[PDB]
Design an enzyme around this catalytic site. Structure first.
Site, mmCIF file in Angstrom:
data_model
loop_
_atom_site.group_PDB
_atom_site.id
_atom_site.type_symbol
_atom_site.label_atom_id
_atom_site.label_comp_id
_atom_site.label_asym_id
_atom_site.label_seq_id
_atom_site.Cartn_x
_atom_site.Cartn_y
_atom_site.Cartn_z
ATOM 1 N N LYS A 1 -0.888 38.349 110.920
ATOM 2 C CA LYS A 1 -2.177 37.671 110.821
ATOM 3 C C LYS A 1 -2.284 36.859 109.533
ATOM 4 C CE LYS A 1 -4.326 41.351 113.434
ATOM 5 N NZ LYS A 1 -5.611 41.721 114.086
ATOM 6 N N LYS B 1 -13.784 44.472 119.017
ATOM 7 C CA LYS B 1 -14.286 45.593 118.228
ATOM 8 C C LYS B 1 -15.110 45.106 117.040
ATOM 9 C CE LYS B 1 -14.398 49.885 116.650
ATOM 10 N NZ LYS B 1 -14.831 49.702 115.240
ATOM 11 N N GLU C 1 -8.266 35.195 118.175
ATOM 12 C CA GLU C 1 -8.123 34.636 119.516
ATOM 13 C C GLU C 1 -9.351 34.915 120.373
ATOM 14 O OE1 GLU C 1 -6.087 36.780 118.099
ATOM 15 O OE2 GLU C 1 -4.150 35.805 117.777
ATOM 16 N N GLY D 1 -8.055 50.797 120.789
ATOM 17 C CA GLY D 1 -8.124 49.685 121.723
ATOM 18 C C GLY D 1 -7.270 49.895 122.959
ATOM 19 N N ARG D 2 -6.042 50.370 122.774
ATOM 20 C CA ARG D 2 -5.135 50.601 123.891
ATOM 21 C C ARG D 2 -5.467 51.863 124.673
ATOM 22 N NH1 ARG D 2 -2.717 50.951 118.905
ATOM 23 N NH2 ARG D 2 -1.802 52.967 118.341
#
Lengths: 548, 548, 79, 79
Positions: B513, B207, B213, B268-269
């Site tokens: 994070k 995004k 990662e 996102g999901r």
């Protein structure tokens, strides 16, 4: 412990644990960590290549003392002696549970009914070595007299999950091994779309050689081999069997010298160390398979010799009992931060849930506590973006077991340093959390207005105080993987001993089988009686109104 | 519902549900099935190709009435209207949740801040069609001017799980698609061991284009492409991006015409319907991708139009609320009896657990109930020999969702009849169980002595009364798979509305994070300050004492 | 008339036969009795035979006189 | 070895037998199925050999759904 069953909740150690739980109601791990710089040293232990950090737990030294006391009062030491010595700890089935015997070396002798079963163990190991050396050296040929390079294991349950886990985890130490478990014909089609009948060798892994799905898949494989050009008299070079039913494998067309033995004292979910792990040995070699056996044996020795305060299986089992029986945790997450260990959770699910998913004691009396949580999880650094949000901010208590190595077999720049940092940070965020003050301070440092700060702060708050265990290795080699698997096996055993249940029987899978035969007969036949319930009858009708 | 937050436990429907739970304490589904031949008809529903049987539940008609009343009192209908209409239902992030908009057809218009976002949706769809047609027709070529046949999606979380699920489930409708999510370098090595740089095309799905990662894996892929012979000026034919950061993809070396848009209103999901599902469209084609979108749209219409008594998403969500808030169930098993649907549980885990794993309401007030269980499970007929033993005989209440089709794409003899029978029998055994009398009668019919009968009977007893839902389809095609995914999305939304939480924010992933950056800095640097806790410091030292 | 044709009545009066092309599309749960015999059994036995041959040929399990897989099915028929 | 290249869809089993076709490769043809109404039966065997048995059953299911619509709908909405 398998003959005389008592109520574990009546033990004085259990009542002391209830009182300690009442006292520890308000315990927070963050405060315990700022008030004890030596907490990690006190609550960590090592065994061979395994390192267990269990300091991020809702425990004090008193809690560990009381949990060790409960383990002693339940008789974990004597129960482990009985299981290791060949006593019929499977009281319901009147069998011993001797998966540990599969990892013992040739100098060990174990007498069961006056017979040395270690002779059987090592005869099977030598047979495995012979077959693995034959296939690896391209000395095994099919009906076209061509070398085989595709070994397909037709088996379900313990014949599928453990071997596949070890095959995937030990990939840097690897003939291609495939697994065919599901009765779903789509799996068989997808598998055989990559197989040549002149080249594929099938291992039929069935204890009694009568399992429905395994037999159906084996029959389909034999039909595929026959209809792909193979000949019936020459079938023996494409079908070996691991079974206790030698005659059945004989009429299948399998040579007696290619029939590997299955024993009653070896449970299916505890059998990756026996000939069931034959595909694994075919992928990693017999030296690596023996290294896995040696690691498991070292874990057995650690379990048998160590005091309960430094006994890794006992500590893990006692933490599980603590959280499941005094904090009401119904699930346990397993988070291996290693791409090769992604299938660890499936084998752990079988091993733990099929063993400890019981509601009667060894004598048949109903249990007096919760016995056996849900095992779930997934590969590390992938679950952070998938479900770790529920771990951090949900309303459930889910103890987590982080597993990570220090060294990567395939380093790619600083990716493994980031993987290790992500595992450590997930554990640290679970233990610490983020309070309202910290979130407000961060929002203020970002320059947000006061109204925005007070609007956004409650949503960013992580409660913290989520217990976790960390298992660290230097590298994931066959030895340390074997130690890890044996450690979880012994943890399951200790938990089952504490709960007073039989961890080696599976009686909850027979009713489904009988009802499956009934439902299949109803689906296929024309004039069949109604099903027992209207829901199953309606689902049968839905099938019949659409199947052609 | 996202502006004014109330306490759901104070609703009169909630108190009526508490009283009904007290009354239903002694309810047994077996008795309800022998005393009501029309139970299946009363408690089943259909929607397009989906059939939901929810009769094997701890419900009566009064229970369904009260659950529908609670759904009405919580405002599920108005909340669904607000979410579908573009209102900022993501109160914490001040965003709309418009994943449903991604499945609307070209005749639908949705105005957000006076702009028609459906134009963006269908422009992205046309761009996807252009790229998919180019690649499928071998009209896309690499730096060696050779056709590409390996599409690798570099993305994590919602960029990985949903697309991979749809790719695997829709295999009979399938250029090979691979996924690269884990920062574990071993995954990257295993993936690139099958890839040619002249042939592989990489989709960077991020995004912000700043995810750790994803960026690390993309940088590794770019380095691999450059060091495998590819040229920097010609890199554009091997790297497309789905991102909201056009400039970042520009400096990566990606053409603007190959940059697909990501929007804030798409979580996102919830984004497999957008350009994130670009690999899926590259595997099944744009016609099948549109069929999946049409099935999801049909499910949206069913959710919006149906009364709550026949609303499948609302019924599933209300059953989940019932079991999690009045029966203390902390987990929910998903059992798809289809080899292609084996990865359904992973996407369901992300979708449900990242959304409903919350402990504050939409306004920031603490929740007053349990919100969001653990999602777990696995492919059908494989879990019977793995963990269904805990379902049948354990001490936990785990509601199960069985999913099975009637028709198999790859029939192999009578294997699918047996798969269907196994699914139906598992549900029927969960509902019925085996009492002491039945077990004793079976043991007597086997001829065992009386002492043996009384010794073995308690171990064979299955309690029964385990609730389950069955979802049946005629076949698993793109349309019905889209309907299934949308049904579970709407169930998650309805549960989040009932609990008063925000199902579209993920604020529990930021602390991990920040701590990951801190832990990485301590792992790599020489003279670094000690970590906040002694456990993280000890794990850092364990890394430093073994890393080279 | 539709009821009679769907039910197996000899709607082909000239040839004294039923017209049961619809029966070819019924699922396995349907039963149609013609002269006391369930023709749906014939329909679905033929369907299972069709499935067997189609699966054999599709999986390259059908071979000719040279023992090579067949990839050309030619239907010799008219009308 | 001719049997691996010639299958038959016929009501005359003996004729296909003397042609050199195995009995297990002879698909049944019934009187109640007219020739122009028989793509749903084994006559559609080449079609199933091209699209697969799942798609052939999908075609049968669509035809069955049309049969149900024809039988159940009022004539004002009967297509």
């Amino acid at each position: 412990y398998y003959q005389q069953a008592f109520d574990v909740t009546s033990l004085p150690s259990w009542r002391a644990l209830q009182e300690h739980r009442l006292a520890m109601q308000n315990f927070h791990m963050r405060e315990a960590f700022l008030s004890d710089p030596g907490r990690f040293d006190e609550f960590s232990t090592s065994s061979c290549g395994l390192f267990l950090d269990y300091s991020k737990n809702l425990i004090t030294p008193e809690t560990r003392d009381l949990l060790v006391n409960l383990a002693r009062e339940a008789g974990v030491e004597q129960a482990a002696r009985a299981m290791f010595d060949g006593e019929p700890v499977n009281a319901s089935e009147r069998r011993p549970a001797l998966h540990t015997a599969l990892r013992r070396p040739v100098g060990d002798s174990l007498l069961i009914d006056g017979h040395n079963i270690m002779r059987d163990v090592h005869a099977a190991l030598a047979q495995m070595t012979d077959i693995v050396g034959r296939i690896h050296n391209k000395l095994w040929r099919g009906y076209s007299d061509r070398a085989i390079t595709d070994v397909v294991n037709i088996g379900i349950g313990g014949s599928y999950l453990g071997p596949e886990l070890v095959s995937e985890a030990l990939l840097p130490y690897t003939v291609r091994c495939h697994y065919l478990a599901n009765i779903d014909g789509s799996e068989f089609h997808e598998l055989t779309a990559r197989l040549n009948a002149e080249t594929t060798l099938f291992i039929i892994s069935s204890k009694t050689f009568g399992t429905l799905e395994t037999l159906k898949n084996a029959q389909a494989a034999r039909t595929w081999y026959l209809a792909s050009g193979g000949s019936e008299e020459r079938l023996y070079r494409h079908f070996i069997a691991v079974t206790s039913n030698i005659p059945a494998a004989i009429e299948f067309g399998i040579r007696e010298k290619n029939i590997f033995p299955m024993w009653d004292w070896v449970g299916g979910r505890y059998s990756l160390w026996s000939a069931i792990g034959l595909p694994t040995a075919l992928a990693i070699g017999m030296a690596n398979f023996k290294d896995l056996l040696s690691g498991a044996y070292a874990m057995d020795c650690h379990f048998r010799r160590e005091p309960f305060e430094n006994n890794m299986p006992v500590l893990l089992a006692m933490l599980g009992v603590w959280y499941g029986n005094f904090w009401g945790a119904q699930s346990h997450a397993i988070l291996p931060y290693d791409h090769y260990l992604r299938n660890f959770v499936k084998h752990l699910q079988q091993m733990d849930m099929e063993s400890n998913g019981k509601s009667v004691r060894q004598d048949g009396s109903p249990v007096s506590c919760e016995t056996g949580p849900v095992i779930w999880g997934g590969v590390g650094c992938n679950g952070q973006h998938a479900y770790h949000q529920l771990l951090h901010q949900g309303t459930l208590l889910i103890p987590a077991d982080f597993i990570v190595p220090v060294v990567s077999h395939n380093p790619v720049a600083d990716h493994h340093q980031w993987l290790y940092a992500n595992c450590l940070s997930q554990s640290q965020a679970l233990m610490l959390g983020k309070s309202r003050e910290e979130a407000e301070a961060e929002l203020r440092a970002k320059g947000l207005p006061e109204a925005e700060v007070k609007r956004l702060a409650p949503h960013k708050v992580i409660p913290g105080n989520r217990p976790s265990n960390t298992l660290v290795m230097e590298t994931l080699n066959p030895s340390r993987l074997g130690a890890l698997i044996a450690l979880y096996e012994h943890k399951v055993f200790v938990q089952g001993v504490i709960w007073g249940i039989n961890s080696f029987d599976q009686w909850g899978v027979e009713l489904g089988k009988e009802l499956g035969k009934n439902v299949y007969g109803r689906l296929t036949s024309y004039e069949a009686p109604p099903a027992e319930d209207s829901s199953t009858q309606g689902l049968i009708d839905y099938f019949r109104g659409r199947h052609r």
